[PDB]
Design an enzyme around this catalytic site. Structure first.
Site, PDB file in Angstrom:
ATOM      1  N   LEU A  14       0.811  -1.213   0.000  1.00 28.09           N
ATOM      2  CA  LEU A  14       0.000   0.000   0.000  1.00 28.09           C
ATOM      3  C   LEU A  14       0.849   1.270   0.000  1.00 28.09           C
ATOM      4  CD1 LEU A  14      -2.397  -1.387   2.692  1.00 28.09           C
ATOM      5  CD2 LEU A  14      -2.994  -1.008   0.269  1.00 28.09           C
ATOM      6  N   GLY A  15       1.938   1.248   0.760  1.00 28.93           N
ATOM      7  CA  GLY A  15       2.768   2.425   0.933  1.00 28.93           C
ATOM      8  C   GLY A  15       4.149   2.055   1.423  1.00 28.93           C
ATOM      9  N   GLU A  16       5.031   3.044   1.502  1.00 25.72           N
ATOM     10  CA  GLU A  16       6.437   2.799   1.793  1.00 25.72           C
ATOM     11  C   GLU A  16       6.979   3.959   2.621  1.00 25.72           C
ATOM     12  OE1 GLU A  16       7.826   1.066  -1.685  1.00 25.72           O
ATOM     13  OE2 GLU A  16       9.751   0.357  -0.915  1.00 25.72           O
ATOM     14  N   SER A  18      10.544   5.251   5.494  1.00 29.17           N
ATOM     15  CA  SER A  18      11.802   4.995   6.184  1.00 29.17           C
ATOM     16  C   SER A  18      11.911   3.522   6.567  1.00 29.17           C
ATOM     17  CB  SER A  18      11.893   5.877   7.428  1.00 29.17           C
ATOM     18  OG  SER A  18      11.547   7.215   7.120  1.00 29.17           O
ATOM     19  N   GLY A  20       8.951   2.299   7.547  1.00 33.03           N
ATOM     20  CA  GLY A  20       7.650   2.093   6.944  1.00 33.03           C
ATOM     21  C   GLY A  20       7.447   0.730   6.317  1.00 33.03           C
ATOM     22  N   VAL A  22       4.518  -0.783   4.295  1.00 31.98           N
ATOM     23  CA  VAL A  22       3.226  -1.266   4.774  1.00 31.98           C
ATOM     24  C   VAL A  22       2.531  -2.060   3.681  1.00 31.98           C
ATOM     25  CG1 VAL A  22       0.894  -0.600   5.537  1.00 31.98           C
ATOM     26  CG2 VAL A  22       2.897   0.691   6.354  1.00 31.98           C
ATOM     27  N   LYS A  37       2.429  -3.599   9.354  1.00 27.98           N
ATOM     28  CA  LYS A  37       3.337  -2.482   9.461  1.00 27.98           C
ATOM     29  C   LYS A  37       4.723  -2.987   9.841  1.00 27.98           C
ATOM     30  CE  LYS A  37       4.028   2.116  11.571  1.00 27.98           C
ATOM     31  NZ  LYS A  37       3.473   3.174  12.474  1.00 27.98           N
ATOM     32  N   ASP A 126      -5.169  12.745  19.752  1.00 27.44           N
ATOM     33  CA  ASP A 126      -5.199  13.177  18.367  1.00 27.44           C
ATOM     34  C   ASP A 126      -6.444  12.718  17.593  1.00 27.44           C
ATOM     35  OD1 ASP A 126      -3.922  14.742  16.349  1.00 27.44           O
ATOM     36  OD2 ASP A 126      -3.070  12.923  15.429  1.00 27.44           O
TER      37      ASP A 126
END
Length: 248
Positions: A14-16, A18, A20, A22, A37, A126
């Site tokens: 899905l994503g990338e 440091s 990271g 994922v 993750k 948050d």
């Protein structure tokens, strides 16, 4: 790297980043979607990750993101999180204004989750859409543990302290947004924005029901001491309406 992993079938990254990296995947037998993750040596530059894990492990709620497994080695820490492919953010933007009934439905789910966190002595700090995920039956899932706009006066500062009264504030902004499709304090001028927040300067539209107007009004109190508590919310008349059994 490996299109499969003890029950889980890798699909695509899905994503990338440091450390990271994922990837998405799903339970071989159960079919449940999952994000992995991945983390390692890079982390040398740690405390928040043990925090995550211990936290996610401790919290089993229908409206908090599930941690199925943490798989450790001498390099990698791989987290097996529950997948939710959307944010509450997207749901808000992509449709126009949502009925009181609809926002009470999501709201009840958020507050539920939050009350659970606090009971276990953990404050989010948050809360926001994009921290509020949605599954496919349209269920909210808190995900964390981008915008200054849902942050309470005590958070936007950094002299006063951030207690549970603070998630309440967030949750009031979130209500107001679902209800008004506009942020209570939103401004182009950064200073004017924080000034507004710290002074609790906002408009309650007249189109708001007396029940929702009333509950939002009590959530956006600058003084944590007069701000409504989570418990007091759950006993609000407007909030109780159609409040599912399980959420008790």
């Amino acid at each position: 790297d490996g299109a499969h992993i003890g029950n889980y079938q890798i699909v695509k990254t899905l994503g990338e980043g440091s450390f990271g990296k994922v990837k998405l995947a799903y339970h071989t037998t159960t079919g449940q979607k999952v994000a992995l993750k991945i983390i390692n040596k890079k982390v040398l530059a740690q405390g928040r990750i043990e925090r995550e894990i211990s936290y996610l492990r401790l919290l089993r709620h229908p409206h908090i993101i599930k941690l199925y497994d943490v798989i450790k080695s001498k390099d990698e820490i791989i987290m097996v999180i529950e997948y939710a492919g959307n944010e509450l953010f997207d749901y808000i933007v992509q449709r126009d204004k949502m009925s009181e009934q609809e926002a009470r439905r999501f709201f009840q789910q958020i507050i539920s989750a939050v009350e659970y966190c606090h009971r276990h002595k953990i404050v989010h700090r948050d809360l926001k859409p994009e921290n509020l995920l949605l599954d496919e039956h349209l269920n909210v899932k808190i995900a964390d543990f981008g915008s200054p706009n849902y942050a309470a006066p005590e958070v936007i500062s950094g002299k006063l302290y951030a207690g549970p009264e603070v998630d309440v504030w967030s949750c009031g902004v979130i209500l107001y947004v679902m209800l008004c499709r506009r942020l209570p304090f939103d401004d182009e001028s950064i200073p004017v924005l924080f000034k507004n927040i710290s002074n609790g300067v906002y408009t309650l539209p007249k189109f708001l029901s007396p029940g929702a107007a009333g509950l939002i009004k009590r959530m956006l109190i600058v003084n944590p001491l007069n701000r409504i508590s989570i418990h007091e919310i759950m006993q609000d008349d407007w909030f109780k309406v159609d409040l599912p059994e399980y959420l008790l």
